[PDB]
């Protein structure tokens, strides 16, 4: 139900917060 | 440098986010 | 200027992640 | 129980992403 759709969106959050280390690792390159 | 040291902090809380993402779609079904 | 657009991006996200929990409270709760 | 838990670990994690977040900043200006 709803706890399932929490834990979608979360999953979701964690593939974004993923995405955002790897843009700030490419920005450290140069 | 430092950015790169931060880069890997994000990466491991993405890791931890992952982890929790996954306890609970085990909660939602148990 | 990037660096900062980055930071407002992981801030963004923390506020999803809090108002995520929060969810999962109430539910938890009720 | 277990939901409750789970909650504030990721309340935990939200505040430790602020706090890179803010690491950042200080980085970006520094």
Known sequence: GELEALAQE??????????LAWKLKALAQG
Request: positive net charge; hydrophobic residues 60%.
């Open 10 to 19: 979360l999953e979701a959050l964690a593939k974004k917060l993923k995405a």
